[PDB]
Design a protein around this ligand. Structure first.
Ligand SMILES: Nc1ncnc2c1ncn2[C@@H]1O[C@H](COP(=O)(O)OP(=O)(O)O)[C@@H](O)[C@H]1O
Ligand SMILES: [Mg+2]
Lengths: 619, 574
């Protein structure tokens, strides 16, 4: 829960160090372009005061001095008007002198035109420096993903890493372009707008800065009173998505057993109560401004009344009070959006230390470049003793030796260390105190890429990225023409159901009509592994959802028909594993018993009492 | 965005005289914030231009009344703005759900189950959050300009030409930047969702990407998405950098010309001095109402693509409906007569099923079998009308199935689908779907028939153990047997198992089938399975391969007559 705010902030700010030339020239350009829109109102007020001095002075007796005119005004009973006359610089009998007004306005216009191309450039440079430090972070995260060990990816929540490279970089981008453009400028418009507002009148500036505590207490009391409602609506919309999910995912079981009426009544009874919960949460949290703008007018009324009452007394000039009104309006704006600038900074700095924690984690084992080549296949293990977390040994001692061209087939109960053993062979995890030697040479000292690009593995669960079926099948060898993709898509029996689909080989299987079955999604994956033309093929229950006849056809055309290569066949259906070259029965590591099907069945062991659950039907 | 407006004028129809109470309060609340400078111009003109000390303090009472009338109709406008924008969003998802529930299996599976929930829960809430933002904080930009012109006409109308020229150019120079920015801004959201998807695919398949060493291809297909997103976000910020400067320059130049053209009037004696103070605040209020309004136009491109998906769901006419004159037999006792049924996807080269023709008598049992993808997956969903047969006819004992009311059809078909799905709640309310009024001891009979009694009875609260949302607490065959019992207590005329016993082992499959044979002694049972050990006892068995049927018979007359079935059962012995 944003357990750091200082070091994370400094690291995120120093992330802009490479773009320091375009950050210094944004800091110094949003200062000289913002302290020129503050001195603009002063010039405008001087222009309007040149008008007033002439207008209220041209009707006085021409010839009399200013002090004599004030004395005459005060002598006829006009006291407040005499104070007004003494309060400004008038010369009786002279008009407006439009030369001075024109020269003042020609300077106000000039530095209003300069200030508008001094902010367009400040915004363009700020965009360039933001959308170039974002590219670096996004390309550093992607370079870290391909270097983290698998033990990091499969030891987190389901979407914990996904909503850290996707939703936590967007917040960093938001809170790095909002606190350089919208949070820095609306602190200079609170510093300069207030230091120029104090050289005018230090009394009226006290009627404005007591609306910062007032507009903060009210905006902190509305938010911390709209909590029984901002949580009772986020929880009531959670019962809407928990009902729509279970009425859409089990839709064929709602249609049949015709509880459509009940499932619709339940939705209509908790939609009418999420409407009510959201109404209060959007009303109380929506009235946060009509209230910080109410004390932006309680201050404006006081400023206007006191400023008029003080011009009438001559303690200040009308041209100063005109500028003071604009300063009040510029100072009372940064407050109406000070919560919607602070809650989006806590969010953007909270999802900015998780990213650097991800970037601060340990990389992989820094592989050794040797480029090992598998000649025949001697995958032989030697006393492998892998353990996931110290204290619970998963795979104990085992010495499963392979052969240059046979198909060793691993069987056992669920949770016996088969998929984990496949992960050990692929060096996804590191073996502990055991050799894993493939064809004599140890793969424990071998470049991971060269080893993995020569094995060829399919797993129980399938991966299909957003693309066509053709693109998924051609992923194992992306430099193969369609005459080699369709060719190695007929040995995986995806051709027989791909024409069934509305547009075969182009179905775009991320958004399809749900017409691809679970075993049909495994045939596509097998076709992908056939493209690579591997030399040590492992099928770790890849043919689990498919038919048991297509299973025996695939693992007889690309697992036994291949005289050159050796294959591991891990599966639960023993019918396709019988008569398959050294079945290995394993139970939580510690391979119990092994051999070919005949010798293994003719010994009355765990395999013999396991082949009756499937064939004998005794359990 | 012709679908956002067609979907926005349709569903907030009833809340017409609830946005007409918002567009009449946002007018009073903006003609009262424009009236404070109006009366300040009278403090400067009636109390400052003269001595008239009391006229400054007694005219502050008018200012304090206006600032309260401006807030009672500004918090009273957020009460009706976020009360029609919550009725729209209620009626919108209540109509999305009501239309989705009319979908068939083919149409429901075309959108999905999660892309269909994120199309009715958090997809509505974007248009729903657009209505409460375009009636409370976005119509005040046109109002503060149009009513500002009329206020500048009320006060010394001679110099209202400045505000009649300064706006037509503040909404025209802002309609050009926005016109060029909108297309480059909706293209940037389809482009940042194209990198969140690349990352999602790379993280999910991080175990197989490294297996093919296809890491030179990744982060080079990501370097073409990042560097493409950073060219559409660096270009949308090239137009967004012209909004504040141009809009503030128009206001500043209008303000500078205001003092010149107002001094030319005041010197002539046909204008007062407080009118400049009033106009300089009208311009500033218009600037403030335009800047923050154009800064929150990011919602329109991101809520106009949500409306596209919602309208795609809402413009999907269902193809499976009850006939205008449905035949209603007294009893629908199972007799399936599938003749020449050919189900073909629209545009597909080869039909899923082709010329399948088999009939099952009154109380027998059939077993269809075939390889993966060989049609049989779709055969069950034709009997209960989850799909429409294109060029064939299946009939249940008296009538074509599509010439039969679908609800009375479903009322006597106990379906056990491929994957067992259980609803959140208790076992007592999850297997209650079968009968909904079964006695307590009657629900103990299905759990015995389905071989599910010995795990739900060995529980503290008996048949009341809480089930998870999707029933994920029961891992496998436990869920499958609960789903079997659900249909077991319906006493249907047609038991319809679609790859049900696959999840179970061999002993419990034979136990459940024996229990059915001893209980449903006269119900028509249709079993679909890739196994053979659950097909031996079937009264008739058929094999279908790549669509068409290859052989119809019993086990003995088909094991020595169909080579496909022979090689199917060959990979079964041990
Ligand atoms: N990445 C992992 N992190 C933590 N525990 C794991 C991990 N992988 C496997 N395990 C645990 O170790 C055991 C290994 O069994 P496993 O190799 O999955 O056998 P099988 O593949 O036959 O199910 C499992 O029961 C699992 O709970
Ligand atoms: Mg496994």
């Amino acid at each position: 829960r944003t357990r750091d705010f200082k070091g994370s902030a400094i690291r995120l700010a120093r992330r802009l160090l490479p773009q320091r030339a375009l950050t210094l020239a944004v800091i110094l350009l949003g200062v000289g372009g913002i302290a020129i829109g503050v001195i603009g109102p002063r010039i405008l007020g001087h222009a309007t005061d040149l008008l007033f001095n002439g207008v209220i002075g041209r009707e006085l007796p021409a010839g009399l001095t200013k002090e004599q005119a004030v004395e005459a005004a005060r002598a006829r009973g006009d006291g407040t008007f005499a104070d007004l006359l003494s309060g400004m610089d008038i010369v009786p009998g002279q008009g407006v002198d439009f030369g001075a007004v024109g020269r003042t306005l020609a300077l106000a216009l000039g530095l209003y035109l300069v200030a508008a191309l001094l902010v367009w450039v400040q915004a363009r440079l700020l965009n360039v420096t933001v959308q170039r430090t974002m590219v670096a972070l996004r390309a550093e995260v992607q370079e870290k993903i391909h270097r983290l060990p698998l033990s990091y990816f499969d030891s987190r929540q389901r979407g914990e890493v996904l909503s850290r490279v996707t939703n936590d970089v967007d917040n960093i981008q938001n809170s790095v372009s909002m606190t350089i453009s919208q949070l820095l400028t609306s602190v200079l418009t609170v510093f300069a707008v207030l230091v120029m507002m104090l050289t005018i009148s230090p009394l009226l500036t006290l009627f404005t800065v007591v609306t910062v505590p007032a507009s903060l207490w009210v905006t902190r009391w509305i938010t911390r009173r709209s909590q029984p409602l901002f949580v009772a609506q986020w929880r009531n919309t959670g019962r809407l998505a928990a009902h729509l999910e279970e009425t859409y995912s089990g839709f064929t079981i709602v249609k049949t057993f015709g509880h459509r009426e009940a499932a619709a009544g339940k939705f209509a009874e908790l939609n009418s109560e999420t409407q009510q919960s959201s109404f209060g949460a959007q009303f109380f949290s929506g009235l946060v401004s009509p209230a910080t703008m109410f004390i932006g007018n309680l201050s404006y009324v006081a400023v206007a009344v006191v400023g008029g009452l003080q011009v009438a007394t001559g303690q200040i000039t009308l041209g100063s009070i005109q500028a003071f009104i604009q300063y009040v309006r510029q100072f009372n704006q940064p407050l109406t959006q000070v919560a919607g600038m602070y809650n989006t900074l806590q969010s953007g700095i909270a999802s900015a230390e998780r990213v650097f924690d991800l970037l601060d984690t340990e990389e992989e084992s820094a592989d050794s470049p040797r480029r090992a080549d598998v000649r025949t296949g001697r995958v032989e293990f030697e006393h492998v003793s892998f353990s996931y977390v110290p204290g619970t040994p998963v795979i104990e001692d085992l010495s499963l030796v392979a052969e240059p061209g046979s198909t060793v087939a691993i069987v056992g109960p669920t949770g016996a260390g088969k998929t984990t053993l496949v992960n050990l062979l692929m060096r996804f995890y590191d073996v502990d105190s055991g050799r894993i030697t493939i064809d004599g040479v140890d793969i424990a000292s071998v470049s991971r890429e060269s080893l993995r690009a020569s094995i060829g593995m399919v797993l129980q669960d399938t991966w299909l990225f957003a693309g066509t079926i053709y693109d998924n099948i051609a992923y194992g060898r992306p430099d193969a023409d369609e005459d080699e993709v369709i060719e190695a898509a007929t040995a995986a029996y995806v051709d027989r159901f791909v024409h069934t689909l509305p547009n075969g080989y182009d179905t775009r299987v991320d958004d399809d009509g749900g017409a691809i079955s679970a075993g049909e999604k495994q045939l596509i994956t097998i076709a992908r592994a056939v493209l690579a033309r591997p030399k040590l093929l492992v099928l770790d229950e890849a043919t689990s959802s498919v038919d048991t006849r297509t299973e025996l056809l695939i693992a007889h055309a690309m697992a036994e028909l291949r005289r050159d290569r050796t294959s591991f066949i891990i599966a639960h259906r023993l019918s396709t594993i019988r008569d398959a070259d050294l079945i290995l029965v394993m139970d939580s590591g510690r391979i119990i018993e092994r051999g070919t099907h005949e010798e293994l069945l003719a010994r009355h062991g765990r395999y013999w009492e396991m082949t009756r659950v499937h064939l004998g039907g005794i359990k | 965005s012709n679908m956002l407006w067609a979907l926005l004028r349709q569903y907030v129809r009833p809340y017409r005289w609830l946005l007409a109470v918002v567009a009449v309060l946002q007018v009073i609340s903006n003609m009262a914030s424009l009236y404070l400078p109006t009366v300040n111009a009278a403090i400067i003109d009636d109390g400052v231009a003269k001595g008239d000390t009391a006229r400054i303090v007694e005219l502050g009472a008018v200012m304090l009344g206006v600032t309260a009338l401006q807030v009672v109709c500004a918090v009273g406008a957020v009460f009706f703005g976020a009360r029609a924008a919550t009725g729209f969003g209620h009626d919108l998802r209540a109509a999305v759900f009501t239309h989705v529930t009319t979908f068939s299996a083919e149409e429901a599976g075309r959108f999905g189950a999660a892309s269909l929930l994120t199309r009715t829960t958090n997809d509505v809430g974007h248009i729903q959050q657009l209505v409460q933002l375009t009636v409370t904080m976005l119509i005040t930009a046109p109002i503060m300009s149009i009513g500002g012109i009329f206020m500048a006409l009320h006060q010394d109308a001679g110099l209202s030409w400045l505000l009649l020229v300064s706006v037509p150019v503040l909404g025209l120079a802002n309609y050009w930047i926005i016109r060029h920015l909108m297309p480059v801004f909706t293209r940037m959201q389809s482009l940042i969702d194209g990198i969140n998807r690349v990352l999602r695919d790379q993280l999910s398949g991080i175990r197989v990407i490294r297996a093919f060493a296809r890491e030179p291809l990744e982060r080079v297909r990501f370097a073409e998405a990042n560097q493409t997103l950073s060219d559409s976000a660096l270009e949308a910020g090239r137009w967004q950098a012209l909004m504040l400067p141009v809009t503030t320059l128009v206001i500043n130049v209008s303000s500078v010309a205001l003092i010149w053209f107002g001094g030319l009037r005041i010197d002539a004696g046909q204008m007062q001095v407080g009118s400049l103070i009033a106009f300089l605040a009208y311009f500033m209020q218009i600037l403030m109402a335009v800047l923050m309004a154009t800064f929150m136009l990011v919602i329109f491109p991101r809520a106009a693509v949500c409306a596209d998906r919602i309208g795609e769901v809402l413009s999907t006419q269902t193809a499976i409906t009850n006939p205008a004159d449905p035949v209603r037999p007294a009893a629908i006792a199972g007799d399936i007569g599938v003749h020449d049924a050919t189900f073909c996807y629209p545009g597909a080269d080869r039909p899923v099923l082709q010329d399948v023709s088999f009939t099952v008598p009154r109380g027998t049992t059939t077993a269809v079998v075939g390889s993966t993808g060989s049609g049989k997956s779709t055969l069950i969903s034709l009997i209960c009308r989850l799909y429409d047969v294109t060029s064939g006819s299946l009939r249940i004992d008296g009538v074509d199935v599509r010439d039969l009311d679908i609800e009375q059809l479903w009322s006597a078909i106990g379906l056990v689908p491929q994957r067992g799905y259980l609803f959140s709640g208790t076992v007592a309310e999850n297997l209650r779907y079968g009968r909904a009024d079964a006695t307590d001891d009657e629900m103990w009979e299905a759990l015995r028939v389905a071989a599910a009694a010995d795990f739900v009875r060995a529980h503290p609260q008996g048949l009341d153990m809480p089930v998870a949302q999707g029933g994920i607490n029961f891992s496998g065959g436990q869920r499958q047997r609960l789903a079997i019992a659900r249909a077991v207590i319906r006493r249907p005329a047609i038991y319809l198992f679609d790859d049900a016993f696959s999840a179970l082992d061999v002993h419990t499959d034979a136990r459940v089938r024996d229990a059915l044979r001893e209980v449903a002694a006269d119900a028509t049972v249709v079993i679909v399975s890739q196994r053979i050990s659950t097909v031996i006892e079937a009264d008739q068995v058929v094999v279908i391969d790549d669509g068409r049927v290859v052989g119809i018979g019993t086990h003995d007359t088909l094991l020595a007559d169909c080579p496909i079935y022979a090689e199917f059962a060959e990979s079964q012995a041990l």
